[PDB]
Amino acid sequence: RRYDVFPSFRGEDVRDSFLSHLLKELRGKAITFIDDLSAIKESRIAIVIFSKNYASSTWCLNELVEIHKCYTNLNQMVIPIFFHVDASEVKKQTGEFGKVFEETCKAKSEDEKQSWKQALAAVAVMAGYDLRKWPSEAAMIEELAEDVLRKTMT
Numbered sequence: 001r002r003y004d005v006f007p008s009f010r011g012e013d014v015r016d017s018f019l020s021h022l023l024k025e026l027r028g029k030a031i032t033f034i035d036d037l038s039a040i041k042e043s044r045i046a047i048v049i050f051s052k053n054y055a056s057s058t059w060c061l062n063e064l065v066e067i068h069k070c071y072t073n074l075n076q077m078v079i080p081i082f083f084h085v086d087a088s089e090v091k092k093q094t095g096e097f098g099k100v101f102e103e104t105c106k107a108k109s110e111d112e113k114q115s116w117k118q119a120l121a122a123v124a125v126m127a128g129y130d131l132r133k134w135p136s137e138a139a140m141i142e143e144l145a146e147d148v149l150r151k152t153m154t
Contacts, residue, residue: 005026005034014049026148029148040076045076047081052096052100054097061119067119087130101116
């Protein structure tokens with residue numbers, strides 16, 4: 001309830017580009033969001049932006065697990081975005097996305113690797129926004145913002 005939207009993303013991939021356009025569009029519709037774990041359960045909608053290096057951040061991966069928990073236990077709405085990554089690669093941790101993931105997992109416990117793999121497989125099959133299926137970033141973000149606005153009614 002405190003926030004409409006919790007956005008989860010790798011800042012190095014999207015902060016100054018794709019995400020700047022999305023947040024501007026959300027602001028124009030008076031959709032609130034937190035500014036960059038505790039805040040996730042305080043948010044009605046999680047927007048997960050999967051990009052090439054999402055999997056290089058344990059911060060992002062741990063956010064995803066929490067988002068998964070909020071989806072399961074608090075009826076958090078979750079919207080995946082695929083930003084130059086293959087959705088099945090995210091879902092199955094294969095391809096470039098997988099290799100970054102595996103690289104990241106080397107220094108990490110097998111249980112949180114499992115928890116990560118599960119949250120990725122669960123969020124990656126959710127209905128969302130795959131940039132290859134839209135005519136532009138601007139068109140996709142426009143539909144996503146109106147989607148998010150409808151979701152604040154509920």
